[model samples]
Target: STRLRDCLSNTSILPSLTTFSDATNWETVTSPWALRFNPEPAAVVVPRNRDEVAAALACAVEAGVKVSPLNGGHSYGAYGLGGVDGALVINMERFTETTFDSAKNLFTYGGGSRVGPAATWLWENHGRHFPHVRANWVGLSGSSIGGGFGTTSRFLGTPMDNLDSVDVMLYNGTIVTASRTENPDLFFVIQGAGSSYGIILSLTTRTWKPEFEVATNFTISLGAVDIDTGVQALMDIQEWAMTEAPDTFALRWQLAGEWNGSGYFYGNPDEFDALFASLVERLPNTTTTTKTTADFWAMENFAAPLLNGTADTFPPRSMYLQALVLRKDQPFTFESAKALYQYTTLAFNRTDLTEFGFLDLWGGVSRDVDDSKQAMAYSNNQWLIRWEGRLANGLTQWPADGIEYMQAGFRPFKEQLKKEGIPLRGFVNYRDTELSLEEWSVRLYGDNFEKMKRIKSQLDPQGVFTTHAQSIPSS
Candidate 1:
């Protein structure tokens, strides 16, 4: 299935192509976010520039085919889409180019490019860094469109908050760039619904002068005896961070599933020890590792496997979920994390559910927005949990495969939350793939759904610019 000999035979599409299989490696290459099963894509076309993106979109539109644009392979469960047999996937992994303009604090880069490398370049060339809340292998293309959250997120905001504009290929094969000043509607759409709206090629984003030092830390043995304690400890951390912390600081909480359990934290060093001590006092005795202004790349990548475990390889794809929990800290905790892990244990043989875990993100970054006007959901909620597991062989249903087992684990937690009368919302990227276009749209845009829909109808009347459908419904 990994061989691309047949892909090269697609001479009619690109007559100048050599080995079609050699042209693009969609067969084995996957994204970092692997939660759902990923069947082999029919073809993986790599474009050297914008012209190819347009050409590919034009062909798909005329041929009446469905398409999915992939980058850093983060759309794990996104590939499990049912009723899409002959779907076309444009895999843009080689499109890595970083253009820096220091005057306006403006930096433009390829959407298909990963931030890990991008940040590396910035640090190397300019000796600069910003609160660009980034993960190890996340791509700008999909993340910005769906509102990406990261380490710096606690201080700055989602990755898209720093965005300015993007270049994309419309369903009609027209290549266009949208920014705050031009094509404003499309500009807003990418903020909450990037991948679903168009084929993102390149993007211009807000970049600041790099920081002097970044302090990162990792903690083993969650200092939590009960789920409630862990939840309260985390909430306390959140409350303290946004208030006492500066824009230069960032923070995040991640629960890992090995044979058992583990949790980690990262941010300014001054805060790391106190954060670790408080968390430990609340939970129990735990081991610790401190990164004293270590290299940003090493620290960021060390704990990133939890972010990209579901995928088998590059073009990382899988089914997954991220649910937000809002309660008095009783419903969420190490116990709740265990409840969730118990399911992964059955699904993954209780081994290392490395691919099965959720991040508790939200607090500092979100406060920047007028909680009321923000386009994202989960403003009132306390926890932002993401869940997803990749599916395979084109089957889409529960109780059929490992995906089912993974989902079954959530049933208890879902019920547990309701039984406890807890309330909250979910993330837009980790949305339920089963939701309709309108339902999904509202999840990402919040109250901006109607405006989003009206805008969508105007720019893409034929509904041709459809992929993930994270847009609101209009006309």
Candidate 2:
């Protein structure tokens, strides 16, 4: 860095003294990106704009520096992929944007364009929206490229499902645009490979008609569990709802406590009560009217903010968990779920981990997409269960208090699936940074990893997009 800094200082850095801030204790500043994947980088490099980003990257390239991209500073597997020791970073947070074509229902926004404004724009302008998931604040670049979910996911597929085009900065400092008919190869890869490709500058996503009215239905219960009956009820409702509803419908199941099994439902309530009664009436319960109208953004963030947690303190900061997308008849489905819940109960017994799970709850809108066409069918399972636990210690060695319990919780499924060679994709957001390539590949891309790699090589030939931990590098 001494030589590199001197070189950069004389060239672009010194000329634009504004760009090069005095270097401070970047290790502490950069630790936020130290996710579940690899360990934290030695330091951080933040560059502004495409040229500054290019300049920083070129400096790093010449100086033999490793770099990563940090957009809104949240990534599962903790691949800040942007910040590293001597590693230049391009944080897309400040790059957020939203330019809309109301007449055409088009939105051309920066990669870091989060969910808040996009949804707000749709609601305010032409009144059209896309399949953004319940999490409202996800940066558009990462969300779209990562195969995201929301109210529109089931009906329209992932946030990538509505992608019209993207503007990317390649490793060689050249800008490329990928879309349905343009740079289709890059299109295929980046749509599903964010951290593996070059930096995405902006995303152009199209909007759909706003025909579906939103609603919420709450089912509260404080009683003994009726696992079988409750499971059956949920299954019947989901299967039937997807068949007869407007298809814009979505479902959410919020469990009240550390496996208390107090279920809360949010969606269209017209048929929601009957649906709940049919399913959970077998148990002790209370139902309420939650909502009648919510725009795409509102609806998407509804469960997301609640589920992301108050802070990253104990429960995870974001939704990092997704269910085993198995059918109702899947052999270990119930047993597997029970085992997980039982483990959560035990996990909280420890001093380290705070536990939570959003039980199986999904609906027509997100389920209507072609599951097979997806690189990974996160929606394949009738249930969308989740596991979340966070800690303030970003760099702490694995906590031991709950180690055995959490291991018992995850090992069963991880090992069983490994034995069966089932590389079922899990939620990339909730992914364990320690996950093996086998586990990561199966969950992120499923059968599409090879294809994704080919695309990655073709576009990011230098493997510029490689994530440090929790995944295998293509090169």
Candidate 3:
């Protein structure tokens, strides 16, 4: 320990290094955005640039401390902080630099940059946009690495697809740029399964001309009519979504205490209204239909609301939520939607969480790849359904019946998938803690696991970087 300290003291660094006794390190180490998992890091360093990040990580290796990168610290399981005890948390939030190449229509954000500020800058400075930014404070590196999908994803594709290159530092303090043409092997895995590979220093992505200046969103409430009608409405919406242009039409359906749906369109409000007129016409019992228009920057992060008018932000930091994903071999039907709706409503009502689950169309251009090139296997899947129980803000204990309740409620739907020969799967970002290692491995990696494992062993043999849930293999 003395030698490690001496070495670091002599080394030039551009950031603050703090020990366990330092209050700054304590705050950074303990307060993960997802307050659910608070692993105390042995030490914390806020790196200001790529060189400092390399130096800090090198010292951690010399000192034999497990190290993990921390940006927004928004991992559902706090995977940004190494789950193991005594790991070194490398805080990168201070590495905020945004550079753009107007000629190439490309932009780069320091690995530590968050979505809110970065998006705002892009709009104000360039009149450009990255379509599918999902959360307000989500770090660009975090989501991009996980196949980022969002509001305008239908037009631009997910962040993984828009990714141009990444400046990364490996476990041995070796720096490299990974992209389709550079270190392409590393490029393939890091796009989707990046956390275990190394620390990303910056992410450069392609930007698009603003499709339109104003964005319009329509909210339709169905629960006011009844669960059956709401579910049926969603069923119709799902069918319609498959046919509409992926770029101009997108729908996010939610069921909390009532049936609520949100629609995002890049075109004019009148055009959007006509496009979705069938939805309004079909759901005669809809309690209300509300329309709001705003500039791209003002409205990009607005997500589907929860029950009543509660603010819908990122899943509560201290709260726990379980998510499940089902893909249809043939597109899902109104019948299928009806069946799942019945099961989901009953489950939430029984749990008494006023919990809600939602279904949406998942993929488009990005899924058009072979496992040899892309690591995000779920891209090929057609739909996504996620449910969240009320935020258990101060609770640390997992409910004993929680897992079983969800599993049972979703059983009939799972059976239908089995009977239809559709594979049962889970999204990597929303891993369910209830699943086993083997289950996670198969579901998260799909056909890419073996190759991913091979690459993991070759690149990160010591497992220097690790996350709590479904990280790539290192052994």
Candidate 4:
């Protein structure tokens, strides 16, 4: 520890380093979005530029300490804090820089950039946009490195699909550019499963013009419906989405305390109503319905508070999340849908758990893209379901029976998938920290796991990047 600190000090990196002894803000600097994991890192380094990042990694390498990059600090497992105590943390908050190139129609930004501010900058400067996640505080680098899903994803594809290139610093302190024409193999691995390979310095992505920014947002509330009715409504939406939904349509069905559905259509108001009518007609009673035509920024502001629990900011919570990906060919069976509805309602009624779940419709331009084009394995899935369990106020830790309760709710989905012979897959972005590395590798990468392993061996043979539980292992 003394040697590492001395090395950092000699290199003029000590000014940016924060150790456990830094009493003023130790707790504030180390706390992650999900408060379940409290990892006390050995040191946290907030670099100002690519050179400083390289120097910090070099010092960690010399000291034989593990390193993790902290971008927005939203990792459910606290992987941003190295997923465990005593590792070195590279906080990327100072690297925020956003620029637009008119000639190439591209947006270049630092890895520290968050989704909301980056989108706002692009819209204000160029009247353009890129597909990204809904949460304002989610780091663009981490989101794109996984899947980067949003309301515009059905029409524009994920943020990974729009990436033009990335500048990454490897474990050994070597910086390289990954793209189609430069280090293409590294580019392939970094597109989706990048967290295990290197720290991203900056990213350049393709951007769409103002026409793609216009959207009509809509919400339909079922208003505390019965479990059976909620299940039927979900099935109805799934049926229409599978067969007749347009590429311009995207939907998210939520069950917090009531059954509600909201999403956006990238077209005029009349077109949105015409397309949404089919699904609306099939649903049961609609307690309230709203439709508004707005540009990209307005839509983002409208959904920010709902998604993040605050408008344009991230508020930490004591929570756990589990995600499942349902194959397009194997849509949820009626029994499975009923099980989900029952579990959500049961959990919501419990006094100990603050339960919320949502299902995002997939399949459109996102699914049309070939799987070989990127490392995100479950792009072809029909829909993605994320279930969250948070401790009620006044409780800092999960209850003794909390894990069992959450697993019981998830068991039906696994059983149904097994019965149908579909792989028990999940989205890598909403990773389940409970799963073992072997199990999580299979779930997140599926058939691509072997290729990812090979890439890991070539790029990070010493396991310097394997600081998290589910990071790819070197052969």
Candidate 5:
């Protein structure tokens, strides 16, 4: 420990480095979004520039400590703290610069930049927008590099798809630019599995014009219907999404005590209303419904209070989440939907957990891109279903039973899918750390697993970036 501190102090990063022994702000500096895992990092270094980041990594390499980059500290497994105690954390808080090039129609942002602020800045300053999550505090680098999804994604493509290039610092303290034209193999790995490779310094992505900012937002309540009705509703929605829903429309059905559905249409109200009505007529037990036309900023504010945090505060919660990516080719048939609904209904009845589930409509511009062009494993997904098991108010620790409950809930659906010959897959962004490395390799990367491992060996041969649960191991 002393040697690691000494090595860092010998460089220009001494002022930015904070050891566990640091008396002031250590807890605040190293706290993670997910309170479940509290990793006591060997040191936390807030690098102000690319050179300082390289310096921190160099020190960690010399002292033989694992390294993880802290971009927004929102990793579900708290991988930002290196996923375990005693690793070095390189926080990217100071690298929040953003700029726009009107001539090229591109936006360049620091790796540490959060999604909400970056989007707000682009709209307010340049009157342009890009595809990114609606959440205010999610790190742009983490989300984009791991298949970013959001309200505009169905039309404009994900942040990764729009990404032009990245300036990255490899694990061995080597800085390189990765893009389709330069270091293409490295580029492929970073898009979906970046945290396993190196620390991103900055990213440049293509931006759309101001006309892309308008959206017709809507919400509908299903009002705690019977399990059978819920199952039918889901099946009907899935069918419509697969065959009739326009690429400009995106929606998610959420079950939290009562069933609620909300989404956005990237078009005028007239077009959205007609499309929405067709689905509403088919849905069973529908109650309250609302529709509004709003610009991007207004819609963001409306959506902010739901999950996204405000600029002043981002409250932490004790929760466990598991996600499954259902491919467009193998969408939920009636049998699959029935099995999932039964599982969810049983899980939701548990008094000890506040269970919630989301079925987010995916695949529009996302599916149009060839999966082989990038490393994102489940790029052709039709929708992503995520289940959240959260502790009730005043509870901090997530009980073992809660974990088991979630695992069991997913088992029947997975088994049913397997029986139907549909391969189970997961989104890397919504990573479930409970899965073993071998399981994650297959579920997250599929055919690209071997390629990822080969690249991990070639680029991060020393395993400096292998700190997280899903991090690729060197071959």
Candidate 6:
């Protein structure tokens, strides 16, 4: 207590530390978008810059208290809250500056910069481009570590691929640079699962010159088609993705009642028109197929509330989602497709069908990426299917039966996926909270799990940093 107190009151050390007496309000202020966690912290420290960040970490480590650094705080299960309830919480909003080096094509931004502001800054100031997420509020650093995929990802690579380096503060106030040249092992560890390593104060990332690439956000509605026709039509779209450019085409399929598809392509409008001509013609009962053309940001504007909900749309509900990442080679037979169809139609009849069933078919260079260089083992999987369940604004807790009902509905699909040898490698940003620590370690890190443990041991030997994913200390 004295160490933390000394640092907070010292003139050289900058920290606006909040104790438990002032922490009750922060319990609700912990998250901006989703995964509301009201954990009490020993102190919530708002560090203005790198010096203050180092001071906070040193004080927390000296005081023998655990620490968790939160950037934009959009992790699905509130994993931003440290593993221990009353640990030191470092809120990273003060580190949100953006800079550019035109000669080197480099982008350097604070770890806490969100997608919208960061991308907008690049576009407006430098005439450059970065990947833009459907939701604009996700943290750049968090997504970079968790494998960011976005509108431009079909053409560019994941944020991990775009990253040049990161500035990390160790649990005991040591600062180090992780990149291909320096601390290369730590660089590899940070690429996909950096939360296991240390606090990322800022990132030096790759940037690109802006191109007027044509983007199409299309929707395919199957309102009139029965389950059988809808299922077959959806399969037709998935089959189409196999032939498109690895860097030019991607789509998201929503199958709540009617089948709605949002797709993007990186080439010209003539190229896009030819690409979709056959599928639009083949689907017999397709209700509507509309196309809009623009740069990626303009397309983002057109698909605003549908693809990415606005800021006001989130933080109003308790959310739960289950997912499986699948590749094209997997054995999802026609019979398996039909079985999933039956469950979908049944859900349409339910009164409590608040959640949506969706598929994200966003992939490009990732399919052939080298896995040995990074900790994200399943980065090659192209399809993400989620039976995302949600409770409306009024429900305090999701009823046990209701939770089971949604889980049961999706269980068959999970079983089918597993039968086809789909590795349960889920994105840490969107993983469910109910998984066991061991299950999470195996699924998130895969073969790299043991190696991550060793790195954590070497860098955070005392285990001063903690997170909801398998803790470095416990590992």
Which model scores highest in TM-score? 5
Per-structure clash totals for the candidates: 46, 28, 2, 0, 0, 0
lDDT scores of the candidates, listed in order: 0.54, 0.54, 0.69, 0.80, 0.81, 0.68
- Per-residue accuracy of model 5 over 1-475 as CA lDDT, tens digit each: 7898788887787563555557487888778888878888888888777888888898888988888888877778888888878888988988888899888999999989888778778878887778887677888888888887777788888888789999999987888999998999899998789988999999999998745556678887877678777777778888888788888788988744446788888766567777987888877655678988777667766665333345624567678888888888888877787777677755566666788778889877656767677677866788888888888887666787888888887778889999999988888888887888777777877788788889999999888888866888877
Residue-by-residue lDDT tens digits, candidate 3, 324-375: 4554345565555655666766545543333656766665553564545767
Which window of 10 residues has the lowest lDDT sum in candidate 2?
Answer: 307-316
Better of 2 and 5 by lDDT: 5
* Model 2's TM-score against the true structure: 0.78
By lDDT, the better pick of 3 and 6 is 3
Colliding pairs, model 3 = 35-317, 223-259
Q: Which regions of candidate 2 deviate over 4 angstroms? A: 10-22, 25-46, 81-86, 212-214, 220-222, 226-246, 254-323, 327-334, 346-348, 360-381, 392-398, 401-404, 413-423, 470-472
Candidate that scores best on lDDT: 5
Error of 4 at 250 (Å): 1.7
lDDT of 2: 0.54
Tens-digit per-residue lDDT, 1-475, candidate 4: 7877876776756563655546467788887777888888878888777888888888888888888899877788888898867778888988889998899999999998888778878877888889888788788888888887887787888888789999999998889999978988788888768888899999999998746455788888887677778888888889899889887788898855558888888765567777878878878765678888876667767766433233436578777788888878788877888777666555455687788778899888756766666666865778888888889988777787876777788777677778778788888889788888777887777777788889899998887787878788776
lDDT of 3 at 134: 63
RMSD of each: 6.2, 4.9, 3.7, 2.3, 2.1, 3.0
The TM-score values for the models, in the order shown, are 0.73, 0.78, 0.89, 0.94, 0.95, 0.90
Q: What does candidate 6's lDDT look like per residue over 1-475, in tens digits?
A: 5676765566354433454445456555454344334555666777777888887777786777878887767777555656447677777877888999888889899987777677767767876776645566777887788776666676787777788899998776778999988998788878777776789988988877745555676767766767778778767766666664446666777756456677777666677777777667657654678877777657655543333333522344466676666655663455556666566535544444376767777556666667677777655666766676666555566555665676677766666666766666676555666678677777766788778778878887787765554553434
- Could you give me the TM-score of model 6 versus the true structure? 0.90
TM-score of decoy 3: 0.89
lDDT score, candidate 6, position 179: 93
Local error of candidate 6 at residue 428 (angstroms):
2.5
**Model 4 ranges with Cα > 4 A deviation:** 14-23, 212-214, 223-225, 285-288, 305-312
| Predicted structure 5, TM vs. truth | 0.95
Query: Compared with the true structure, what per-residue lDDT tens digits does model 2 show for residues 116-165?
Result: 66666666666666666455455566666666666445456567768888
